[PDB]
Scaffold this active site. Structure first.
Site, PDB file in Angstrom:
ATOM      1  N   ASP A   1      -2.519   7.470  -5.547  1.00 34.94           N
ATOM      2  CA  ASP A   1      -1.152   7.325  -5.083  1.00 34.94           C
ATOM      3  C   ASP A   1      -0.117   7.883  -5.833  1.00 34.94           C
ATOM      4  OD1 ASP A   1      -2.243   4.651  -3.024  1.00 34.94           O
ATOM      5  OD2 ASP A   1      -2.107   6.739  -2.496  1.00 34.94           O
TER       6      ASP A   1
ATOM      7  N   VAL B   1      -9.820  -4.644 -23.754  1.00 35.88           N
ATOM      8  CA  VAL B   1      -8.587  -5.300 -23.311  1.00 35.88           C
ATOM      9  C   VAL B   1      -8.108  -4.280 -22.176  1.00 35.88           C
ATOM     10  CG1 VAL B   1      -7.918  -6.381 -25.329  1.00 35.88           C
ATOM     11  CG2 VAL B   1      -6.923  -4.338 -24.979  1.00 35.88           C
TER      12      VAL B   1
ATOM     13  N   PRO C   1     -11.092  -0.660 -26.199  1.00 32.18           N
ATOM     14  CA  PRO C   1     -11.406  -0.600 -24.987  1.00 32.18           C
ATOM     15  C   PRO C   1     -11.499  -1.876 -24.091  1.00 32.18           C
ATOM     16  CG  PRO C   1     -12.783   0.725 -26.510  1.00 32.18           C
ATOM     17  CD  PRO C   1     -11.654  -0.272 -27.415  1.00 32.18           C
TER      18      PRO C   1
ATOM     19  N   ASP D   1       5.614 -11.341 -28.519  1.00 37.41           N
ATOM     20  CA  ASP D   1       6.812 -10.639 -28.251  1.00 37.41           C
ATOM     21  C   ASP D   1       7.921 -11.014 -29.190  1.00 37.41           C
ATOM     22  OD1 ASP D   1       8.940  -8.796 -27.009  1.00 37.41           O
ATOM     23  OD2 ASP D   1       7.103  -8.285 -25.815  1.00 37.41           O
TER      24      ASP D   1
ATOM     25  N   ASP E   1      -6.359   1.490 -18.097  1.00 38.76           N
ATOM     26  CA  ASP E   1      -7.240   0.919 -17.072  1.00 38.76           C
ATOM     27  C   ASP E   1      -6.491   0.853 -15.590  1.00 38.76           C
ATOM     28  OD1 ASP E   1      -9.606  -0.331 -18.366  1.00 38.76           O
ATOM     29  OD2 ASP E   1      -8.143  -0.717 -19.869  1.00 38.76           O
TER      30      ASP E   1
ATOM     31  N   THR F   1       0.950  -1.216  -0.140  1.00 35.95           N
ATOM     32  CA  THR F   1       0.028  -0.026   0.077  1.00 35.95           C
ATOM     33  C   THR F   1       0.816   1.164  -0.137  1.00 35.95           C
ATOM     34  OG1 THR F   1      -0.273  -0.367   2.265  1.00 35.95           O
ATOM     35  CG2 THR F   1      -2.023  -1.161   1.086  1.00 35.95           C
TER      36      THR F   1
ATOM     37  N   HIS G   1      13.977  -8.387 -25.189  1.00 34.77           N
ATOM     38  CA  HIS G   1      12.851  -7.806 -24.808  1.00 34.77           C
ATOM     39  C   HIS G   1      11.551  -8.781 -24.224  1.00 34.77           C
ATOM     40  CE1 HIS G   1       8.685  -5.364 -25.532  1.00 34.77           C
ATOM     41  NE2 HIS G   1       9.487  -4.465 -25.118  1.00 34.77           N
TER      42      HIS G   1
ATOM     43  N   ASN H   1       4.941   4.496 -25.279  1.00 33.44           N
ATOM     44  CA  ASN H   1       5.777   5.226 -24.489  1.00 33.44           C
ATOM     45  C   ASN H   1       6.241   6.599 -25.347  1.00 33.44           C
ATOM     46  OD1 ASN H   1       6.554   2.817 -23.018  1.00 33.44           O
ATOM     47  ND2 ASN H   1       7.332   1.966 -25.124  1.00 33.44           N
TER      48      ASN H   1
ATOM     49  N   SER I   1       6.158  -1.675 -21.813  1.00 31.64           N
ATOM     50  CA  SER I   1       6.459  -2.852 -21.894  1.00 31.64           C
ATOM     51  C   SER I   1       6.756  -3.704 -20.758  1.00 31.64           C
ATOM     52  CB  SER I   1       7.554  -2.955 -22.902  1.00 31.64           C
ATOM     53  OG  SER I   1       7.471  -2.668 -24.260  1.00 31.64           O
TER      54      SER I   1
END
Length: 279
Positions: free
Chosen positions: A260, A177, A175, A39, A200, A16, A69, A161, A224
């Site tokens: 936060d 996913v 929307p 990937d 999300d 938290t 990657h 990015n 990523s």
């Protein structure tokens, strides 16, 4: 369970508060779930995968990860030391070449592959797909990601990015996913992270230590890197029975640490993935 001196991102998703270094998680650890990492491939022979990783599809002359990657992302999903879901089964689908590039049609084919291939795999606790890739808006790419999700797979995708609104990138802008932005160890939005109403959830994305090719490790940054934290978290929660592939993104958002993060543009969710684990 407790893993001391864990990478900061694992500690963050079980806390938290920022500023701790132990990762706490139920010992079930995603056993019985499966995560597809779509990937550059996965170096399945890396000791960190313990025999739990395997390549299942490539669109290139080899299934080898010649980039790193994909191996890094797979490590954040499920490696023993660097992974969220330390007992999940990892499946590699190489849609990106060793320079990290891929045609949209190949990426679409890889997503349709996972939607079918999961019926060939034993994943009684559930199936996740982690997509640390993207490019400019494409309705066809979005439709493919929506199909994969609709087939019963928790689809987690990188927001991108470019420090821009993710509505202009795919599959980030689909929307249905789970679109994942990146944060840093001081609970700031990562400087490069895309944003916007389509996001999300945020996960750790700046300075993320994980597996690399050649049996090595390194720290890199990106949305990523945030995406596989969320994919691994989904697998972990699905193994616990707390959610399903169709509901896991909503569940992660409902149970996230709220308010936060700093440098969140107005209109973007201020939600940081959190496993809610109580010892």
């Amino acid at each position: 369970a407790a893993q001391t001196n864990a990478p900061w991102g694992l500690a963050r998703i079980s806390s938290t508060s920022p500023g701790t270094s132990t990762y706490y998680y139920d010992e079930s650890a995603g056993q019985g779930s499966c995560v597809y990492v779509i990937d550059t491939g996965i170096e399945a022979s890396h000791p960190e995968f313990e025999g739990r990783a395997q390549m299942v599809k490539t669109y290139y002359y080899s299934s080898r990860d010649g980039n790193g990657h994909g191996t890094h992302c797979a490590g954040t999903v499920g490696s023993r030391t660097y992974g969220v879901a330390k007992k999940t089964q990892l499946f590699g689908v190489k849609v990106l070449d060793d320079n990290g590039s891929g045609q949209y049609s190949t990426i679409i084919a890889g997503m349709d592959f996972v939607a079918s291939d999961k019926n060939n795999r034993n994943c009684p606790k559930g199936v996740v797909a982690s997509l640390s890739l993207g490019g400019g808006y494409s309705s066809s790419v979005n439709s493919a990601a929506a199909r994969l999700q609709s087939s019963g797979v928790m689809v987690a995708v990188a927001a991108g990015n470019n420090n821009a609104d993710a509505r202009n990138y795919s599959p980030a802008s689909e929307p249905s996913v789970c679109t994942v932005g990146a944060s840093d160890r001081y609970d700031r939005r990562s400087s490069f992270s895309n944003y916007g109403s389509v996001l999300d959830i945020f996960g750790p994305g700046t300075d993320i230590l994980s597996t690399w090719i050649g049996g090595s490790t390194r720290s890199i940054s990106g949305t990523s890197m945030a995406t596989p934290h969320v994919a691994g978290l989904a697998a972990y929660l699905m193994t616990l029975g707390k959610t399903t592939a169709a509901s896991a993104c909503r569940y992660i958002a409902d149970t996230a640490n709220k308010g936060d993060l700093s440098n969140i543009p107005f209109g973007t969710v201020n939600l940081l993935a959190y496993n809610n684990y109580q010892a």
